[PDB]
């Protein structure tokens, strides 16, 4: 297991514009489009960010790619936020996928709030982090996902996604 499989079991991958589970204008493996309503919004941004005019619709292989770019994005951004950089730098290999899937799912800024989780778990308390971080509407909406991810950071193992 790595972080790409990880990401790839909880967000699946679909190869047209459809709506994430906020209601989203999404594509492929779990990549935003936009926040707004509109499709047709959503099919500019796709096209822009394909460099093609594709109506929607894009190959398996696009779909990789832009996986590919947002996985490096989420590591970056984490390396180069003050907040979240200690806590990655502390944190084992299988943890820090832990944090990399939160951070794609909500972003850097949202992540950046747990603030008593992300100090707990630099302090690796982990069964107290597992207990706060469950304390979130991030929890409440997708609470299956979620408790992978708590698994993942209470045990150090990759149990919950075998
Ligand atoms: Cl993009
Ligand atoms: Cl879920």
Redesign the pocket.
Same mark, same amino acid.
């Given at each position: 297991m790595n972080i790409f499989e990880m990401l790839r079991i909880d967000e699946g991958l679909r190869l047209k514009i459809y709506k994430d *589970?906020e209601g989203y204008y999404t594509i492929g493996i779990g990549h935003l489009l936009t926040k707004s309503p509109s499709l047709n919004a959503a099919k500019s941004e796709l096209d822009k960010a394909i460099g093609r005019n594709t109506n929607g619709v894009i190959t398996k292989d696009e779909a990789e790619k832009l996986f590919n770019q947002d996985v490096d994005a989420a590591v970056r951004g984490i390396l180069r936020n003050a907040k979240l950089k200690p806590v990655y730098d502390s944190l084992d290999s299988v943890r820090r996928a832990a944090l990399i899937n939160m951070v794609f799912q909500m972003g850097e800024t949202g992540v950046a709030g747990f603030t008593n989780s992300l100090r707990m778990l630099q302090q690796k308390r982990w069964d107290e982090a597992a207990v706060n971080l469950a304390k979130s509407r991030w929890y409440n909406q *997708?609470?299956?996902?979620?408790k992978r991810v708590i698994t993942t950071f209470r045990t150090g193992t990759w149990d919950a996604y075998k």
């Open positions: *589970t *997708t609470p299956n996902r979620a």
